[PDB]
Write a protein that binds this ligand. Structure first.
Ligand SMILES: Cc1cc2c(cc1C)N(CCC=O)c1c([nH]c(=O)[nH]c1=O)N2C[C@H](O)[C@H](O)[C@H](O)COP(=O)(O)OP(=O)(O)OC[C@H]1O[C@@H](n2cnc3c(N)ncnc32)[C@H](O)[C@@H]1O
Ligand SMILES: NC(=O)c1ccc[n+]([C@@H]2O[C@H](COP(=O)([O-])OP(=O)(O)OC[C@H]3O[C@@H](n4cnc5c(N)ncnc54)[C@H](O)[C@@H]3O)[C@@H](O)[C@H]2O)c1
Ligand SMILES: [Mg+2]
Lengths: 1210, 112, 56
C-alpha cells in the first residue's frame, strides 16, 4: 500500500535557481515589482526627447490617414447595425452565391426574414456589438435585434441587405483573418512581404476538450507547417514566414495538475511539429496563455531546446507577457537556456491578452495577490524594462517586440540604437490592425525596421469563437486612444517610465480593484486559498499533507463534563481501506440524552455571553482554521475521499461561515433576540467540515448551546472542528460532540430539552425527523424549529446559442466534481435538439480524460464514493437504466481502485425527465434532448420533480434568460457557469420543495431562525406592496374589520417581498439575491380574526392560500374581491391540494400539536409551520413572522461569458 | 402625452406609436421590443400544442415574442429629471370571433 | 415650441420607420381645439401628412 502523499505533486524537474526566482515573483506585491522595472527602463534625456519626437511623427501619420460608413449611409441605429451584421453573417453561411442572392431578393427583402433563417440569427451579436459600438455586452437582447432587423429591412429593403452582406464578407474573410485557409492566407501575404513585412500564421486553435479535438488541432498545425514551409522556399526564419501554436490546443488536460501527462503526451507532439518546422527552416512560436500555464510551458521549452534531434535550427519561439510579474525572471531563464542549448530562441514580448480573466481568477481563488499588474502604465514600464534586457542579449536570443503602441515602439527603436541588421530583432503586429502604424516603420524610406504580421487563419465559425478577446480597443488601449479625438498627441507620447517614477507610491495597486482578501471590504475578511500551480506551495503542502497522515486522529463523545467511553472502531480512507485514518468512539444513547440535559443546564451561561463576544469566538476559530488549513486539507482528503482542490474550497467555506455569521451577529443581535435553547446539529458526510461548522457556528453565535452529531462516516474532521472552536473560546458546556450513527441523531432529536434541530442530509431522513418533532412543542407551546436542507434533482438547460466548449467544462465539473457527491451537483443535462449530438460527443470525449483514484495525488480528478453501500446504491441505478435500453457511457477504472469504493463517472441518455425518480448521489449525469418550442414544457418537467435546489442555464439570448429564470422554481440559479461551489454571503445556498425548508445557509435570514424573536436582517426591506394584500385590506375596511385592515396594511409594509439586491463578489460575475412568494400556504385558523391575520400575512408576502374547510369559517370570507378570490381556495383534504410551501396555524397547545401531526403526514416537502394562539394573535403583530413566508432566490450570472469583462475594460 | 378611459383612444401624441396609427400597416417603432413573455400566453401555447392546433400554437409563440409588453425605457431629456416610458397591459379586450381558429388567434394576441 | 417639437419629432420618427410597405390611409380629417390652437393643430396635421396622407 502506497504511503499517503508520497507522490502528491512532484515537479517535472528539480527547480534551478533561475526557476525558483520565477516562482518567487508569482504574486509579488505590485509596489515591490515596479522600482527595479523603472530602473531598467530608464533612458537618457536625449533619448527620451528623441523617442517622443519619433512617436509624435508616427501618431501624426496615423491620425492623418467601414461599418461606420454603412451606418451613416443608411442612418442605422446601433441595434440596426448589429442586427444587419448578424443577418449578413447568416446569409454568408449559405454556401452557393446564387441561392443566397435569390433568398435575399425573393424572400428576405420582400418581408419575413424569420420564416427563412433552430439557431438565433443573433448568436454572435455580442461580437458584432463590439464591432459596431465599441462596447461589449455579455448577452444579446434578441428581441431588440429582431425588432431592429424588421425595421431596417422594411425601411430600406434589398440595398441595405446587399451592403451588409458585402461588408461582413470583407470583414470575416479579409480583415479579421488573413484568409479562410492557409493557402488563401499565403496568397494574400505576397503583397506586404514585397514591402518588407514577414508573417506568422495562427490557425486559431485553442482549448482542446477531447483527445479527438487535440488530434484535429495537431493535424491542422502539421498541414499548415507544410504549406508555410513550401511557400517559405528557403527564405529562413527571419525573412520567411513562421507559425504560432497554443499548447492548450494540443492536449485536453494541459495543466500543472496533469504535468506527467503533459510531458508524456503533449511534449512528443510539439517535438514532431518542431521537427517539421526545422526541416523547412521556419519559425515555430509557442504562444503564451493563462498565468497558471506559464511555468509548465517552461518545462516543455527546456526539453525541446535540449533535444539533440532539433539541433541546427534556431526557429523555436516563445512568448512572454510583460503584464506578468514574473516576466523579467522568465526572460533571465530563457536567455540562460539559449546560452546552455546554443539555440537562438525567438522571444516574442507581448503585454498580455488575459488580463480580465486573471483578475477574476485570483479573486475567485482567494489568492494572496494577482499574477499580473493592475495598472496599465505598470505593464508599459515592465514591457520597456524587459525590452532593455532583451536588447542586451541579441547575440543569444532574437527579440520580437509585438505592440501597436507608438510610444512603446519609439522608445525601443531609440533604445536599440543605430546598428541594425536583419536578424538582430524585429517588431510584430496583428493583421488588419497594425499595418497603418508599421507602414510608417518598415522600409528604407521609414525607420527601416522589419515587422512580422501575426495572421489569423480560419473559417467564419472558428473566427467568431475567440474574436471578442482579440478586440478587447478597451479604454486604456492605444488603438482606442489614438482614435479618440479628445486625446491629444502629447497625452499619447507621455513617457510611462517617468509617470510611474513621479507617482507618490511607486507601483501602487489600482484603486478600484480589490485584492482577493478584501473582496468584502469592511464587512469581513475573505478566506484565503492556496495556489496549486505554485511549486513552492506544492512543496510545502506535500510535507504538511504527509505530516497530517502521521497523526493519530481521534473522535470521542465530548460531553460538558469531559470525554465519555463508548464503542471504538477505526476510520478508513474510502479510496483505500488499507489506509487507516483514525479512530472514533461513538456515543451511547444514554450519553446523548445526558448531553442534552447538560446543554439545557448550561444554556443560561452561554446566552449571557454578549453577542459581540460570541462572534469574537467565531472569528478566532476562523483564524485558527486558516492557519491550520494544510493539516485540515490532509484530513479531509483521506477521511472523506476529497481532492486537494475541493478540500481547500471546503476549508475556505468553513472559514467563510464563521466570519459571515460573526458579522451578521454584530449587525443584528441584541438582548431581545433570545436563544431557543439546546440545538441539535446533524450534518452530512459530504461537506464534513464546512456544513458541520456552518450549522454549529450559527447556532452558537445566536446564543444556543449545541449538540453536534456528525455523520458516522466522517467523525475525525468533526472532532477537529470542535477542538478548534473550543480553543477559540466556545465553552465545553456550549458545544458537545456526539459521534455515532442515526440512532444518536434520533436520541438527540427526541430529547425533551431539545429546542431546535438543524439538519442537512437526505430528504427521507429529514422526513423522519419532522415526524418525530411533530409530537413535540416548546415550553411556550410552539413547534420546535427545524432547518432541513435536503436533496436536489438539479438540471442545466443548454440552447443552440451556448458555446459548446464552455458548456462541456461546466457540465464535467458540475456533474463529476467530488464524484457527484454535492447536493448542488448536476443530475440532468437538457440539450436543445440541434446541438445535442455535437455537445454529447464532446462531453463523452471529456469524460474519458478524467483520472479516478485515491485522492492523495494532485493528478486525481474524481475520488471514491464514501461507502460500499453508496457504491452499491449508485451502481444499482446505473444497471437499471442499462437494463431498460438507455445508452450508458462509463470510463474504465484502474485496477488500483479495487482497494476502495469507486463508481466511474457515467453518462446516461434518457428519453424523458420522468425516467428519473429519485436523487442518485454519485457521479451519474443524465442527458435529455428538447425541441426549442418545448422549452416551457421542459421547465415544467424540471419543476415537476418537486426538488428545487440548483439550476443552470447556458444561453446568450436575453429572451431565453428572462423566460427560463421567471418560470424555474429553484433556490440557486446559475447563468453561463457551473452550478456548484456556492460561496457564503455571495450565493446564499438553499432551495425549496423537496430540497429544503430554508432559510438559506450563508444568507441573512439564517440566524433569525435560531432565536425566539427574529431580528431585522441587514438590507432586509422592500418598498413594494402586494396588490392583493391591498385589495384584501380594503375589503376588510368595507366589512368593518378596521383593526384587521390596519394589521393587513402593516403586514403589506413590513413584508420584504420584492427585495432585490446585488451582493459583493468577484469581478466578471453578478450575484443577485431576491425575495419571492413561497407558493401556496396552508391556513389552519380557529377564529374569524385569526383567519384575517393569517390571510393578511400570506397575501402580504405574495402567496396564495388553501384554507382548512374544517374550520367552518367560510362565511367570514363572503364576497371577496376577485383578485383576492383568485388567491384563495378551501381544502377539505389537505393531502390532495398540495404541495404547500408553508403553513399558519391558530389554536391552543393541543390543537397546534394535532395540526402539526397532520401536516407532517402530508406527502412531499417539509412545511415550515408557524403557530400562535388566538391571544397571541391579538397581542403580537408579529405572531406570524413574515421572514418565513417569503422564498429566497440566489442568481449568479457569469458576465465574462462572452469572452471579456466590459466593466473592467474601463 | 395621452391617456386611457374617457381621456381618449391613444396612441400618445409626441410618442413612438403615433404614426403607426396613420398607415395601413404599422412599422416597428424605435426601441419597441421587450424580452418578457407573458406567462399566461405561454400556458395557452402549451394547451394549443396538446390539442394538435399546431398553426395556432406557433402563432401564439410568435405573439409572445413580438409583444412589447414590459418595455421600460428612459427617454433623453433635461438634467434633474428622469423621464420614463413603459408599456403595460390595456385591460380586458372584447373578442368577437367567427371561427375557432380565429378565436385562438385573437386570444393569443390579447394574452401576449 | 411644442408645435416646432411635433414637426421635428414626427419628421425623425418618419426617418426611423416608414418604408414602401407602410401605405397611407387616405384623406385624414384633423379637428383641433381652441386651447392649443397652434400646437395641437400642427401636431395632428404634421403626423397625418408625414405618414403620407392629405389633410383636411
Ligand atoms: C501584436 C501581437 C500581440 C499578441 C501576440 C502576437 C502579436 C504579434 N500573441 C499572440 C496573439 C494572441 O494569442 C500573444 C498576445 N498576448 C498573449 O497573452 N499571448 C500571446 O501569445 N498578444 C496580445 C498582446 O498581449 C496585447 O494584448 C496586445 O498586443 C495589446 O497591447 P498593445 O501593447 O499593442 O497595446 P497597449 O494598449 O499599449 O496595451 C494594452 C495592454 O495593456 C495591458 N493592460 C490593460 N489594462 C491593464 C491594467 N489595468 N493593468 C495592467 N495591465 C493592463 C494588457 O496587457 C493590454 O493588452
Ligand atoms: N441542501 C444542502 O445544503 C445539502 C448539503 C449537503 C448534502 N445534502 C444532502 O445530504 C445527502 C447526503 O448526505 P448524508 O448521506 O450524510 O445524509 P443522511 O440523510 O444519510 O445522514 C445525514 C445525517 O442524519 C443522520 N441520520 C440518519 N438517520 C437519522 C435519524 N433517523 N435521525 C436523526 N439523524 C439521522 C446521519 O447520521 C447524518 O449525521 C444527500 O441527499 C444530499 O443531497 C444537502
Ligand atoms: Mg446516511
Amino acid at each position: 500500500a502506497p504511503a499517503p502523499f508520497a507522490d502528491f505533486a512532484p515537479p517535472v524537474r528539480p527547480q534551478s535557481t533561475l526557476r525558483r526566482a520565477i516562482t518567487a515573483a508569482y504574486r509579488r506585491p505590485e509596489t515591490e515589482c515596479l522600482p527595479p522595472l523603472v530602473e531598467a527602463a530608464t533612458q537618457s534625456k536625449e533619448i527620451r526627447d528623441a523617442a517622443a519626437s519619433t512617436a509624435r511623427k508616427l501618431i501624426e501619420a496615423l491620425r492623418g490617414k467601414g461599418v461606420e460608413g454603412l451606418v451613416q449611409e443608411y442612418s442605422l441605429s446601433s441595434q440596426e447595425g448589429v442586427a444587419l451584421m448578424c443577418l449578413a453573417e447568416a446569409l454568408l453561411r449559405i454556401p452557393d452565391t446564387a441561392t443566397r442572392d435569390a433568398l435575399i431578393r425573393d424572400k428576405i427583402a420582400d418581408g419575413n426574414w424569420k420564416s427563412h433563417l433552430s439557431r438565433s440569427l443573433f448568436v454572435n451579436a455580442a461580437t458584432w456589438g463590439l464591432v459596431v459600438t465599441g462596447k461589449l455586452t455579455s448577452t444579446v437582447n434578441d428581441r431588440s435585434l429582431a425588432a431592429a432587423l424588421t425595421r431596417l429591412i422594411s425601411r430600406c429593403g434589398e440595398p441595405v441587405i446587399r451592403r451588409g452582406v458585402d461588408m461582413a464578407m470583407r470583414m470575416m474573410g479579409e480583415q479579421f483573418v488573413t484568409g479562410e485557409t492557409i493557402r488563401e492566407a499565403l496568397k494574400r501575404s505576397k503583397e506586404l512581404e514585397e514591402k518588407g513585412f514577414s508573417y506568422s500564421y495562427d490557425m486559431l486553435g485553442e482549448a482542446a476538450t477531447t483527445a479527438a479535438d487535440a488530434e484535429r488541432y495537431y493535424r491542422d498545425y502539421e498541414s499548415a507547417i507544410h504549406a508555410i514551409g513550401k511557400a517559405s522556399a528557403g527564405r529562413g526564419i527571419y525573412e520567411g514566414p513562421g507559425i504560432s501554436i497554443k499548447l492548450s490546443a494540443l492536449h485536453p488536460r494541459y495543466s500543472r495538475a496533469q504535468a506527467a501527462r503533459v510531458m508524456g503526451e503533449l511534449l512528443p507532439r510539439v517535438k514532431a511539429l518542431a521537427l517539421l518546422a526545422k526541416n523547412y527552416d521556419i519559425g515555430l512560436n509557442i504562444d503564451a496563455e493563462e498565468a497558471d500555464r506559464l511555468e509548465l510551458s517552461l518545462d516543455l521549452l527546456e526539453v525541446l531546446c535540449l533535444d539533440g534531434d532539433l539541433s541546427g535550427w534556431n526557429g523555436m519561439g516563445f512568448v512572454v507577457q510583460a503584464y506578468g510579474k514574473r516576466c523579467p525572471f522568465v526572460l533571465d531563464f530563457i536567455i540562460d537556456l539559449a546560452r546552455r542549448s546554443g539555440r537562438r530562441i525567438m522571444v516574442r514580448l507581448v503585454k498580455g491578452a488575459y488580463w480580465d480573466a486573471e483578475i477574476k481568477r485570483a479573486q475567485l481563488d482567494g489568492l494572496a495577490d494577482f499574477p499580473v499588474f493592475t495598472r496599465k502604465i505598470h505593464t508599459d514600464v515592465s514591457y520597456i524594462a524587459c525590452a532593455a534586457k532583451l536588447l542586451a542579449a541579441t547575440d543569444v536570443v532574437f527579440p520580437q517586440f509585438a505592440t501597436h503602441n507608438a510610444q512603446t515602439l519609439a522608445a525601443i527603436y531609440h533604445m536599440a540604437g543605430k546598428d541594425f541588421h536583419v536578424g538582430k530583432y524585429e517588431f510584430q503586429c496583428l493583421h488588419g490592425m497594425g499595418e497603418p502604424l508599421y507602414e510608417e516603420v518598415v522600409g528604407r524610406g521609414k525607420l527601416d525596421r522589419p515587422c512580422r504580421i501575426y495572421a489569423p487563419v480560419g473559417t467564419h465559425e472558428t473566427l467568431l469563437a475567440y474574436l471578442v478577446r482579440r478586440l478587447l480597443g478597451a479604454n486604456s488601449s492605444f488603438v482606442h486612444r489614438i482614435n479618440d479625438p479628445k486625446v491629444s498627441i502629447d497625452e499619447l507620447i507621455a513617457d510611462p517610465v517617468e509617470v510611474v517614477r513621479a507617482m507618490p507610491v511607486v507601483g501602487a495597486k489600482h484603486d478600484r480593484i480589490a485584492l482577493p482578501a478584501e473582496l468584502f471590504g469592511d464587512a469581513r475578511t475573505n478566506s484565503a486559498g492556496l495556489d496549486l500551480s505554485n511549486e513552492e506551495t506544492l512543496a510545502s503542502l506535500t510535507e504538511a499533507l504527509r505530516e497530517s497522515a502521521a497523526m493519530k486522529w481521534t473522535a470521542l463523545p465530548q460531553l460538558a463534563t469531559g470525554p465519555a467511553a463508548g464503542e471504538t472502531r477505526t476510520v478508513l480512507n474510502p479510496g483505500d481501506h488499507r489506509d487507516v485514518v483514525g479512530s472514533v468512539t461513538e456515543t451511547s444513547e444514554e450519553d446523548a440524552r445526558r448531553a442534552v440535559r447538560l446543554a439545557a443546564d448550561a444554556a443560561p451561561d452561554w446566552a449571557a455571553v454578549p453577542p459581540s463576544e460570541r462572534a469574537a469566538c467565531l472569528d478566532r476559530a476562523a483564524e485558527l482554521m486558516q492557519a491550520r488549513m494544510p493539516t485540515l486539507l490532509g484530513l479531509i482528503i483521506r477521511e472523506a475521499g476529497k481532492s486537494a482542490l475541493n478540500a481547500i474550497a471546503e476549508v475556505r467555506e468553513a472559514i467563510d461561515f464563521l466570519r459571515y455569521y460573526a458579522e451578521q451577529t454584530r449587525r443584528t443581535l441584541g438582548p431581545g433576540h433570545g436563544p431557543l435553547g439546546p440545538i441539535v446539529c446533524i450534518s452530512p458526510w459530504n461537506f464534513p467540515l464546512a456544513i458541520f461548522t456552518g450549522q454549529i457556528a450559527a447556532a452558537l453565535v445566536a446564543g444556543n448551546p449545541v449538540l453536534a452529531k456528525p455523520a458516522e462516516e466522517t467523525p475525525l474532521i468533526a472532532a477537529e472542528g470542535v477542538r478548534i472552536l473550543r480553543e477559540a473560546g466556545i465553552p465545553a458546556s456550549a458545544l458537545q460532540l456526539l459521534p455515532g450513527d442515526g440512532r444518536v441523531g434520533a436520541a438527540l432529536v427526541a430529547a425533551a430539552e431539545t429546542a431546535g434541530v438543524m439538519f442537512t442530509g437526505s430528504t427521507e431522513v429529514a422526513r423522519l425527523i419532522q415526524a418525530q418533532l411533530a409530537d413535540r412543542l416548546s415550553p411556550a407551546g410552539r413547534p420546535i424549529p427545524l432547518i432541513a436542507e435536503t436533496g436536489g434533482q438539479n438540471a442545466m438547460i443548454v440552447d443552440s446559442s451556448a458555446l459548446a466548449e464552455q458548456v462541456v467544462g461546466d457540465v464535467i465539473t458540475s456533474a463529476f466534481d467530488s464524484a457527484g457527491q454535492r447536493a448542488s451537483a448536476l443530475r440532468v443535462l437538457c440539450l436543445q435538439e440541434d446541438v445535442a449530438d455535437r455537445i454529447l460527443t464532446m462531453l463523452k470525449g471529456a469524460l474519458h480524460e478524467l483520472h479516478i483514484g485515491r485522492t492523495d495525488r494532485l493528478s486525481v480528478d474524481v475520488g471514491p464514493v464514501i461507502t460500499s453501500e453508496a457504491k452499491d446504491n449508485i451502481e444499482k441505478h446505473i444497471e437499471r437504466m442499462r437494463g431498460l435500453g438507455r445508452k450508458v457511457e462509463q470510463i474504465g477504472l484502474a485496477s488500483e481502485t479495487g482497494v476502495g469504493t469507486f463508481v466511474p463517472p457515467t453518462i446516461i441518455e434518457l428519453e424523458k425527465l420522468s425516467d428519473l425518480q429519485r436523487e442518485v448521489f454519485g457521479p451519474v449525469l443524465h442527458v435529455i434532448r428538447y425541441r426549442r418550442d418545448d422549452l416551457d414544457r421542459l421547465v415544467d418537467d424540471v419543476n415537476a420533480t418537486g426538488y428545487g435546489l440548483t439550476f443552470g442555464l447556458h444561453t446568450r439570448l436575453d429572451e431565453t434568460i428572462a423566460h427560463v429564470t421567471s418560470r424555474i422554481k429553484a433556490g440557486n440559479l446559475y447563468i453561463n457557469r457551473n452550478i456548484i461551489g456556492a460561496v457564503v454571503g455571495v450565493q446564499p445556498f438553499g432551495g425549496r420543495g423537496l430540497s429544503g425548508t430554508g432559510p438559506k445557509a450563508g444568507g441573512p435570514l439564517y440566524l433569525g431562525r435560531l432565536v425566539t424573536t427574529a431580528p431585522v436582517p441587514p438590507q432586509h426591506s422592500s418598498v413594494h406592496t402586494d396588490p392583493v394584500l391591498l385589495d384584501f385590506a380594503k375589503w376588510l375596511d368595507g366589512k368593518g374589520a378596521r383593526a384587521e385592515a390596519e394589521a393587513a396594511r402593516n403586514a403589506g409594509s413590513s413584508s420584504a417581498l420584492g427585495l432585490d439586491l446585488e451582493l459583493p463578489g468577484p469581478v466578471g460575475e453578478r450575484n443577485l439575491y431576491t425575495l419571492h412568494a413561497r407558493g401556496r400556504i396552508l391556513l389552519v385558523p380557529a377564529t374569524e380574526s385569526g383567519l384575517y391575520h393569517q390571510l393578511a400575512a400570506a397575501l402580504a408576502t405574495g402567496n396564495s392560500v388553501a384554507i382548512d374547510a374544517a374550520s367552518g369559517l367560510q362565511a367570514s370570507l363572503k364576497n371577496l374581491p376577485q383578485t383576492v378570490g383568485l388567491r384563495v381556495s378551501w381544502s377539505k383534504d389537505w393531502a390532495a391540494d398540495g404541495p404547500f410551501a408553508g403553513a399558519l396555524v391558530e389554536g391552543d397547545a393541543e390543537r397546534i400539536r394535532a395540526v402539526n401531526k397532520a401536516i407532517a403526514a402530508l406527502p412531499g416537502p417539509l412545511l415550515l409551520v408557524q403557530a400562535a394562539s388566538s391571544g397571541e394573535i391579538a397581542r403580537n403583530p408579529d405572531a406570524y413572522c413574515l421572514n418565513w413566508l417569503v422564498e429566497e432566490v440566489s442568481a449568479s450570472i457569469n458576465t465574462a461569458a462572452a469572452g471579456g469583462n466590459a466593466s473592467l475594460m474601463a
